Amino acid sequence: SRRYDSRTTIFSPEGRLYQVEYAMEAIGHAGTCLGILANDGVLLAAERRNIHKLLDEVFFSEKIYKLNEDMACSVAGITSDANVLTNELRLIAQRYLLQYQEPIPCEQLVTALCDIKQAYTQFGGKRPFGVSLLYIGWDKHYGFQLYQSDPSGNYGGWKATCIGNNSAAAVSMLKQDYKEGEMTLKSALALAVKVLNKTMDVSKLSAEKVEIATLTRESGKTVIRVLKQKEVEQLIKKHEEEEAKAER
Amino acid sequence: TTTLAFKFQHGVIVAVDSRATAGSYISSLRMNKVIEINPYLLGTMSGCAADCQYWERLLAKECRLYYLRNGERISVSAASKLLSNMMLQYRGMGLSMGSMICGWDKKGPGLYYVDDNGTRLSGQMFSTGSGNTYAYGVMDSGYRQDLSPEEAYDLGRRAIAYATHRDNYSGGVVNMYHMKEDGWVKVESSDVSDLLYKYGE
Amino acid sequence: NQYDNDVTVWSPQGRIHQIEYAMEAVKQGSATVGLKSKTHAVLVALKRAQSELAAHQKKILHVDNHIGISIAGLTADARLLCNFMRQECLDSRFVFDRPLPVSRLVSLIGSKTQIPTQRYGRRPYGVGLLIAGYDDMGPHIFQTCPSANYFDCRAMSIGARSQSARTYLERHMSEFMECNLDELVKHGLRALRETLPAEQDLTTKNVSIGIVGKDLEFTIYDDDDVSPFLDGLEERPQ
Amino acid sequence: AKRGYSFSLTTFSPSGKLVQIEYALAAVAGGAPSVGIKAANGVVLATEKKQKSILYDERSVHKVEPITKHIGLVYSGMGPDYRVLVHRARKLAQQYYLVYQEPIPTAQLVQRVASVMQEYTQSGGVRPFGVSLLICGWNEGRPYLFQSDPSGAYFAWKATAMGKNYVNGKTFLEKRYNEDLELEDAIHTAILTLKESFEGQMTEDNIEVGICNEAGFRRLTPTEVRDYLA
Amino acid sequence: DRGVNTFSPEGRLFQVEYAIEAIKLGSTAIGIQTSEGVCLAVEKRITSPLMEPSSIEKIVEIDAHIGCAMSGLIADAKTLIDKARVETQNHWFTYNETMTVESVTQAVSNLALQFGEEDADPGAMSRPFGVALLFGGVDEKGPQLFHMDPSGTFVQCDARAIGSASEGAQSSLQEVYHKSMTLKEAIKSSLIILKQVMEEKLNATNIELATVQPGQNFHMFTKEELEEVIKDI
Amino acid sequence: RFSPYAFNGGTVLAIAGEDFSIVASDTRLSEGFSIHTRDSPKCYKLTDKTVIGCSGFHGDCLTLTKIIEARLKMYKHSNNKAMTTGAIAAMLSTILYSRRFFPYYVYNIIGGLDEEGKGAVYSFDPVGSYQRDSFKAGGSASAMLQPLLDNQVGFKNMQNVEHVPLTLDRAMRLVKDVFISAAERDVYTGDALRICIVTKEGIREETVPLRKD
Amino acid sequence: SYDRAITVFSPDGHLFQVEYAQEAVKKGSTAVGVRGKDIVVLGVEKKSVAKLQDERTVRKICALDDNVCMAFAGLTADARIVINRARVECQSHRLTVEDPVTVEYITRYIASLKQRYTQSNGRRPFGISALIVGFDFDGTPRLYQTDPSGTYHAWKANAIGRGAKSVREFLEKNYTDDAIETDDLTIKLVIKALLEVVQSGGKNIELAVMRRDQPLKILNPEEIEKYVAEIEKEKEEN
Amino acid sequence: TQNPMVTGTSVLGVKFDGGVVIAADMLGSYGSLARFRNISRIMRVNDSTMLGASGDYADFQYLKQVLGQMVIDEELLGDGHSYSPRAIHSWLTRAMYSRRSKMNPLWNTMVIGGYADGESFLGYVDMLGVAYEAPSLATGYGAYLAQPLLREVLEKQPVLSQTEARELVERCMRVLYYRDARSYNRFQIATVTEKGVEIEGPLSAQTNWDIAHMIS
Numbered sequence A: 001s002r003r004y005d006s007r008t009t010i011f012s013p014e015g016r017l018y019q020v021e022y023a024m025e026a027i028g029h030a031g032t033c034l035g036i037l038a039n040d041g042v043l044l045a046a047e048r049r050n051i052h053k054l055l056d057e058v059f060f061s062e063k064i065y066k067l068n069e070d071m072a073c074s075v076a077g078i079t080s081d082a083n084v085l086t087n088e089l090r091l092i093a094q095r096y097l098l099q100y101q102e103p104i105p106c107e108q109l110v111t112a113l114c115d116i117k118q119a120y121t122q123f124g125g126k127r128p129f130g131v132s133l134l135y136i137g138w139d140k141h142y143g144f145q146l147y148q149s150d151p152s153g154n155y156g157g158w159k160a161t162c163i164g165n166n167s168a169a170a171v172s173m174l175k176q177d178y179k180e181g182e183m184t185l186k187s188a189l190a191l192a193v194k195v196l197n198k199t200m201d202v203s204k205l206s207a208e209k210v211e212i213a214t215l216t217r218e219s220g221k222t223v224i225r226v227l228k229q230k231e232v233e234q235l236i237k238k239h240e241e242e243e244a245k246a247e248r
Numbered sequence B: 001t002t003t004l005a006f007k008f009q010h011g012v013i014v015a016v017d018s019r020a021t022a023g024s025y026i027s028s029l030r031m032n033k034v035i036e037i038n039p040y041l042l043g044t045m046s047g048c049a050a051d052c053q054y055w056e057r058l059l060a061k062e063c064r065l066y067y068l069r070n071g072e073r074i075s076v077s078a079a080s081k082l083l084s085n086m087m088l089q090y091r092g093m094g095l096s097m098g099s100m101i102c103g104w105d106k107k108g109p110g111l112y113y114v115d116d117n118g119t120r121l122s123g124q125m126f127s128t129g130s131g132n133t134y135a136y137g138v139m140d141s142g143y144r145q146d147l148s149p150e151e152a153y154d155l156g157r158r159a160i161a162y163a164t165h166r167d168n169y170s171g172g173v174v175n176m177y178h179m180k181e182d183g184w185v186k187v188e189s190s191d192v193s194d195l196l197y198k199y200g201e
Numbered sequence C: 001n002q003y004d005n006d007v008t009v010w011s012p013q014g015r016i017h018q019i020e021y022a023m024e025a026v027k028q029g030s031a032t033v034g035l036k037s038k039t040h041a042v043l044v045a046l047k048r049a050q051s052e053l054a055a056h057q058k059k060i061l062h063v064d065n066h067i068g069i070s071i072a073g074l075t076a077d078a079r080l081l082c083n084f085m086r087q088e089c090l091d092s093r094f095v096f097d098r099p100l101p102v103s104r105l106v107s108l109i110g111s112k113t114q115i116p117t118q119r120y121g122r123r124p125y126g127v128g129l130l131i132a133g134y135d136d137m138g139p140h141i142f143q144t145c146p147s148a149n150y151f152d153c154r155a156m157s158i159g160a161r162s163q164s165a166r167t168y169l170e171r172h173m174s175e176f177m178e179c180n181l182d183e184l185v186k187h188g189l190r191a192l193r194e195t196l197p198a199e200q201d202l203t204t205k206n207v208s209i210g211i212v213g214k215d216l217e218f219t220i221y222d223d224d225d226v227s228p229f230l231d232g233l234e235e236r237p238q
Numbered sequence D: 001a002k003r004g005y006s007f008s009l010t011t012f013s014p015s016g017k018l019v020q021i022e023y024a025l026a027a028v029a030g031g032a033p034s035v036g037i038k039a040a041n042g043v044v045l046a047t048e049k050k051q052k053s054i055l056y057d058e059r060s061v062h063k064v065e066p067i068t069k070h071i072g073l074v075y076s077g078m079g080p081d082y083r084v085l086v087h088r089a090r091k092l093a094q095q096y097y098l099v100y101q102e103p104i105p106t107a108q109l110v111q112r113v114a115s116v117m118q119e120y121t122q123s124g125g126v127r128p129f130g131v132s133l134l135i136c137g138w139n140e141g142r143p144y145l146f147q148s149d150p151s152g153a154y155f156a157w158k159a160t161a162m163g164k165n166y167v168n169g170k171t172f173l174e175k176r177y178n179e180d181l182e183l184e185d186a187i188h189t190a191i192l193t194l195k196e197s198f199e200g201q202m203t204e205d206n207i208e209v210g211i212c213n214e215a216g217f218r219r220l221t222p223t224e225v226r227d228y229l230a
Numbered sequence E: 001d002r003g004v005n006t007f008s009p010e011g012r013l014f015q016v017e018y019a020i021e022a023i024k025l026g027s028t029a030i031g032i033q034t035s036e037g038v039c040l041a042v043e044k045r046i047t048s049p050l051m052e053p054s055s056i057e058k059i060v061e062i063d064a065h066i067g068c069a070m071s072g073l074i075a076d077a078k079t080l081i082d083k084a085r086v087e088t089q090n091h092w093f094t095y096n097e098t099m100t101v102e103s104v105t106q107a108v109s110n111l112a113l114q115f116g117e118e119d120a121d122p123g124a125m126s127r128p129f130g131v132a133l134l135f136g137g138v139d140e141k142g143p144q145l146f147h148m149d150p151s152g153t154f155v156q157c158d159a160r161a162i163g164s165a166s167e168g169a170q171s172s173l174q175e176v177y178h179k180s181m182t183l184k185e186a187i188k189s190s191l192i193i194l195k196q197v198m199e200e201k202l203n204a205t206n207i208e209l210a211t212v213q214p215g216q217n218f219h220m221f222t223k224e225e226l227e228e229v230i231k232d233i
Numbered sequence F: 001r002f003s004p005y006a007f008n009g010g011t012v013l014a015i016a017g018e019d020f021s022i023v024a025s026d027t028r029l030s031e032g033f034s035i036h037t038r039d040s041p042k043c044y045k046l047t048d049k050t051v052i053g054c055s056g057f058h059g060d061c062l063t064l065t066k067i068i069e070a071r072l073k074m075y076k077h078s079n080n081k082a083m084t085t086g087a088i089a090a091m092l093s094t095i096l097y098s099r100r101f102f103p104y105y106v107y108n109i110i111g112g113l114d115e116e117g118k119g120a121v122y123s124f125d126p127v128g129s130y131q132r133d134s135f136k137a138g139g140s141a142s143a144m145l146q147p148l149l150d151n152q153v154g155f156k157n158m159q160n161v162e163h164v165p166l167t168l169d170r171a172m173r174l175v176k177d178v179f180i181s182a183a184e185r186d187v188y189t190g191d192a193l194r195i196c197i198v199t200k201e202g203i204r205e206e207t208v209p210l211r212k213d
Numbered sequence G: 001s002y003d004r005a006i007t008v009f010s011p012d013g014h015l016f017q018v019e020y021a022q023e024a025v026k027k028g029s030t031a032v033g034v035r036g037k038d039i040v041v042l043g044v045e046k047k048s049v050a051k052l053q054d055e056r057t058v059r060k061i062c063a064l065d066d067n068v069c070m071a072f073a074g075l076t077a078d079a080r081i082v083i084n085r086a087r088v089e090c091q092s093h094r095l096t097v098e099d100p101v102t103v104e105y106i107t108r109y110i111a112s113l114k115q116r117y118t119q120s121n122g123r124r125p126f127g128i129s130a131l132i133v134g135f136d137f138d139g140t141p142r143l144y145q146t147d148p149s150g151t152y153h154a155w156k157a158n159a160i161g162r163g164a165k166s167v168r169e170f171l172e173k174n175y176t177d178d179a180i181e182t183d184d185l186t187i188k189l190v191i192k193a194l195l196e197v198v199q200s201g202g203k204n205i206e207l208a209v210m211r212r213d214q215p216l217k218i219l220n221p222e223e224i225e226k227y228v229a230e231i232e233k234e235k236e237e238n
Numbered sequence H: 001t002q003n004p005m006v007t008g009t010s011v012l013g014v015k016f017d018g019g020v021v022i023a024a025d026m027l028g029s030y031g032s033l034a035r036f037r038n039i040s041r042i043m044r045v046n047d048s049t050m051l052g053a054s055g056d057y058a059d060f061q062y063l064k065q066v067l068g069q070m071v072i073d074e075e076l077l078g079d080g081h082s083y084s085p086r087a088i089h090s091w092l093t094r095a096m097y098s099r100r101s102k103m104n105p106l107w108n109t110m111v112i113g114g115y116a117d118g119e120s121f122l123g124y125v126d127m128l129g130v131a132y133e134a135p136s137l138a139t140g141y142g143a144y145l146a147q148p149l150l151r152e153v154l155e156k157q158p159v160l161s162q163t164e165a166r167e168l169v170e171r172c173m174r175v176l177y178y179r180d181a182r183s184y185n186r187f188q189i190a191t192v193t194e195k196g197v198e199i200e201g202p203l204s205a206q207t208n209w210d211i212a213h214m215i216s
């Protein structure tokens, strides 16, 4: 029996966890996924990896999930593991609601799933979830928020971040452009398209290859929308028109 | 049973009767109703005898472990709270136990009453048993914070003795303790009826 | 070797090495001798000291009024088997009010000791026992091993250098049936003596004796209680 | 007496790839070809049922199966594994009906069945399923076609192929398939995609085909398959 | 790779033999059984003058009449010590008496080889305890000292040492022991042998000293009292 | 329905002296208005130093004595000695309480010597409340045995009696007398009286005939 | 359930899994605590935040109870489990017993938790060491620290993580009453010992202080940079 | 069993010189109704101990099978050991109390007769676990009717010959038939001796109804 045990929840001589770091590699080969925090909102923007002339487009989104009235997340890694975690995220959110009769604060929901993912690295002898998650939301304590989730079960609050393919290139690109405390949603939407265009593989960019979702606070209600194709078209073309005004 | 305890300027005194009753019959008349946990913890007993014995001994068992673990002895607040929690595990099962916990920790003199229901309160005065109402009457009529050791010994002695005179289920002897800063010292084991004749001049 | 890490793995020769490795633990323990007459069953064991400052190890243990054991091998496995035997003897008295026949108690060991040899993650019992008892069928000497196998014997020796003791008893096995108790114990001691190196012989500190029979319940004599048996000694010859 | 293994048989390799899932994908990529086409007013699902001997009774076992009144199934990969998923799919369809008193939306069945597939990529002592599922359905007056696979991932298709020559069958469909087909046309282009990968002569016994519309899901009779085979 | 309940060709459990080795890395501890009492002594092994002196507890109280010296993996020992303390108080509750030093040691010895992987509980032991223990105290059989290791084997000792310098201290006790030794000579000897086998000089704050004699209970020595026994070098 | 209890009668008495303990009982086992047997003594040897007396529901008394017997052996294998009188009494308390919610309908009295050789008596209730005392009676006729012992052994209600220490001889007659009185009034007491004397030498049994009606 | 022994003894007598967990803490961010006379102060470093990341989230100073706070080093995901287990235990000691937790008790629990993870089936040890800071009800200051093995000790001052060996050695040279006299100089002592190993800049330093009777204080990056000024004015000069 | 269905009445026991004799009538009642008037309430456990049982018959047949198997199991070992009458008595006591303590009793009263080591055995077992030994035994109504007869004879003559025990038993069955409404005139006699267990066929006690003419 122990002959067949891969020993998944075990320590390496250096003091690190192999399966966790091997799971990290899986994320790199998945779609580029960025989140940017603005003054009057917060957004997710992600590369669609399911592209084909023959795909049906039945759902509102491929990588964006609504978890809560006031929260949404985006995913990078193994999509089945992603579906398992997002469904669980929707459950934890509802359990908190049922108990306290008010929406779960952003950080708390993230913390809960991270505790499950961390438990998978310590006991049970199971493979960890090969997924990194980007959470965006609004609570009554810290307002608009953005969070990052590792397969390690580790989390952090960001103003701008990215996970997936060419991730390190995308963040240093954001590190220069991001204007702290001065960013509007219009500025952040334009930056998203800019970072994606340089980071993505097929080069020209398309309304079938990217997915953008905005979280705004409108009329005392948290409004979440997955942007329509006609909207993405104008977002790509406004960057294209500015790419033609960059020479003389 | 009748059981009493009150605190004053020189610590806490504790007095109990010694009668054990089965129905209308006196089974034991020399029954010990005080448990000496450590040199500065004291527990009184009232209600179902076997319930009292077992559970306050189980408290004592744990007050022992606490001292061996923490190496610093257990507080009065901790002890009485632990007993209340043991009582709460057996809810609505018919345990009958009324106890008072006495001791001296850093907070000073500690007096506590614990119920079989789980009730737990701190105070200056308490009385448990079938003769508590009689013990209360003589206690209140002749209590002041400014009692001397001799005055308090007189009051606690009086309170049990008079309770045992009116209470069908109280008698035997008065067993009294003085809880001092450096632990309890056992005062007396005086016959109840002997005192009642003395008080009758 | 790769056929020797688990009890659930058969060797191509048709053997289980982990049983045989546990059988080695018995041989490393100090020698112990069991023998019987028509009336008594006697256990004689050699106590051992790791250093001269430490005391000698217990070798003979109580089971019931009519059953006693001497151990050889791992201490914890011996203590575990002793407690099972005691529990079985207790249950027998609790239910039937009569002492558990020796044959049946040993059969229960044979059944219990077999279980761990056939399950993965489990291991054989690292102890061999010599069982002396008395029942309706008279005195008994039994032998158990790490392998669940057990034997009914006229006399037996297990442990370090038990071969020497085994040969002594094999010569004098016809002697035992008409033996007086005092003569029976001396036979047991004389076999145990053969196990020791020529430099050293049986002392009051390193010899333990257990006796059960028609006359009395199982008794352990250790120190001062042992010298009556040692005194009256034919000298160590060669 | 027994007690199962409690450790995962699917782990991350240094490359970040769950090899057992990709190895399970190889099992389906080597199975008999299967095709599904969403056709505006219905759905069609067809498979190669070539038993490779005249001794077999072609009527005895089926590859195109009904899950409920309005949902059907085909597979490429291992037959025995597929049977498990069919039985699980049928139970999930009933579990949904009992609670909601409404035919399970195809999307919801696929999600529930895909989650069962996910389990076997993480649970102890088990290998993943060596099957990819093609699930058709009709609900809310709309045709649906879905693909489930060993990963536990699911996709929505206008048209697709899987198994042997899944790459050639897919490009054929890209050129051949146009939106707004009639259902009877879709059976043709389904059998045509099947002809690309065949090897032998097609009889109504060699292939199996099911259809789904507003009237529910049914498997075509051998007589019906013959009429399309001209 | 093998399981935790695997026998060596020699006839021993690997994990046990390896646990014995872990003790050879632990600080040295000595116990002496005197006809008029038992003394336990151990080196603390201070790693930095920033560490609090009385913080390390390698000699603890189990009962009024029992003391336990520990060596090896300190963290493993304190799980076993709580179990020893629980047993005494369970026994007190049930029998209204103090346990014998032999029975207390026997109780701890029952946890010995209670480890494994398969056919076990969710919280069952994965390995043995990398600890050796010296149980020293006074019961109705006079003063006694017992030694225990991870094999489960326990035996009485007139005097014993365990730890890193085990053989060195064992020989030093061997030539310096009379079964008629006084308690004054008993504490002295342990203090004399301790400085010889150590890498650091004997300070009043460097060691722990304990006595269990018939008259008075187990006693933890105070720095001032230590300076009176270290006065006679 | 169905009752798990039967009442079988029997009274048990114990008295403590300087170097002796007495445990005494009737030999009558009964049920309803019928006698089961005339040869059922309630005294039982546990050790050379300790003797028990059980009365009430005989089914409980039998199973309880067997529990104690087994528990005595368990102790001695574990501790390498005999369980003392005080230890047995402490153990009995816990055994009886483990059945607090389905009690042994049983009245136990323990008689033996303490570690100083002095006489010790322990009186129990069906549920395990116990203490040490000079003398105690338990069972159907305990209220008949008690007051006479209170007066004669305790010297209660008397003015100028010099308070003579209790002798074996005097206690023996006292034990005999109270049972002779009880057999005349209690219908559940009669047939024969068995006295068990615990001393440093051991256990000696004595039998005196009683009313057989 | 998963029943495999993860942490086992090596032939040399080493617990490799526990030792690997100590490698994880040595890779951890620098954490230092020091006991003063009237107050106790923790300081944590190797922060290196991308300044695109909101730092309110990645704070390594945690409060376990009203009178207890802690700092960790190593696997930050593991720490969160330990911290919240200790927070639950803080409220349970308040429910079972009236009294709030003593610093030594909470340290003992955290240590017993870590120890349990070295001897239980199916799980790996925690990858953190902790520094526990608190006050007794009598008011005497207490500082403790734990490690993956399960051992705990009280300290006057201590450091864990990377640069622990370097900072620890600094504290031995710099721990006298001249430094502990005031409350300000003890805070300064932390910052100085901290700025001694980190990639310099008070912007990477989060430290907490708690007085005998006051609620826990996390300091403004204003307040600490004011003290970084009193070090640079007295560095080129002193 | 909470409520017994088919019951048997009094079982008789008394020990003579060189053995024991047991009697029980061959009736199984369903309430007041005589349902089975030719069924055996006695068994041979082995060659040393025998058993007659009162109360619920299904519980008796169950205990008959459990005891039957125990004897078979022991005979298989063939180790020179067998269950003594006391051992069977002790087991049965432990069985009844155990079932009684789980509030699910075996609704039986038992008489166990036996001969071993030159000594006669007679033991009583209740459904509550009440157990003892006596020279004479009678369950149910026998305890009120037959038991007084036996005791009055055994007082005058402690030792009986097998013949004397037999005629005393037949005399007791006469009283039981006259006085018990739940009895019948078909019964068996069981005997243990040096030779073993012997159960004798259907017997009737001699009745006299001449007092039917003495009412004028």
Ligand SMILES: *[C@@](C)(CO)[C@](*)(O)[C@H](Cc1ccccc1)NC(=O)[C@H](Cc1ccc(OC)cc1)NC(=O)[C@H](C)NC(=O)CN1CCOCC1
Binding pocket: B001, B002, B019, B020, B021, B022, B023, B027, B031, B032, B033, B045, B046, B047, B048, B049, B050, B052, B053, B096, B129, B130, B169, B170, F103, F125, F126, F127, F129
């Ligand atoms: C006074 C005398 C009034 O009862 C005291 O409360 C005394 C308390 C006490 C505490 C420790 C030591 C000795 C005395 N109480 C009793 O004497 C007590 C009365 C009582 C009986 C039953 C109760 O539960 C409903 C509550 C109180 N007497 C007893 O405990 C006696 C010794 N126990 C029994 O009668 C046992 N029963 C219980 C069921 O089985 C049959 C007999």
Ligand SMILES: [Cl-]
Binding pocket: A077, A078, A079, A080, D151, D153
């Ligand atoms: Cl995937």
Ligand SMILES: [Cl-]
Binding pocket: A123, A124, G001, G002, G003, G121, G122, G123
């Ligand atoms: Cl687990």
Ligand SMILES: [Cl-]
Binding pocket: C015, C016, C019, C020
């Ligand atoms: Cl073999």
Ligand SMILES: [Cl-]
Binding pocket: C073, C074, C075, C076, E151, E153
């Ligand atoms: Cl060993």
Ligand SMILES: [Cl-]
Binding pocket: C026, C027, C157, C158, C159, C162
């Ligand atoms: Cl051998």
Ligand SMILES: [Cl-]
Binding pocket: D004, D005, D006, D007, G001, G002, G003, G004
């Ligand atoms: Cl497993």
Ligand SMILES: [Cl-]
Binding pocket: D079, D080
């Ligand atoms: Cl098939």
Ligand SMILES: [Cl-]
Binding pocket: D095, D096, D099
């Ligand atoms: Cl549902």
Ligand SMILES: [Cl-]
Binding pocket: D066, D217, D218, D219
């Ligand atoms: Cl169909």
Ligand SMILES: [Cl-]
Binding pocket: C074, E012, E013, E016, E017, E151
């Ligand atoms: Cl070993």
Ligand SMILES: [Cl-]
Binding pocket: E020, E023, E132, E149, E162, E163
């Ligand atoms: Cl060692």
Ligand SMILES: [Cl-]
Binding pocket: F166, F167, F168, F169
């Ligand atoms: Cl006298």
Ligand SMILES: [Cl-]
Binding pocket: G091, G092
């Ligand atoms: Cl809680």
Ligand SMILES: [Cl-]
Binding pocket: G116
């Ligand atoms: Cl745990």
Ligand SMILES: [Cl-]
Binding pocket: G025, G026, G129, G159, G160, G161, G164
């Ligand atoms: Cl460190």
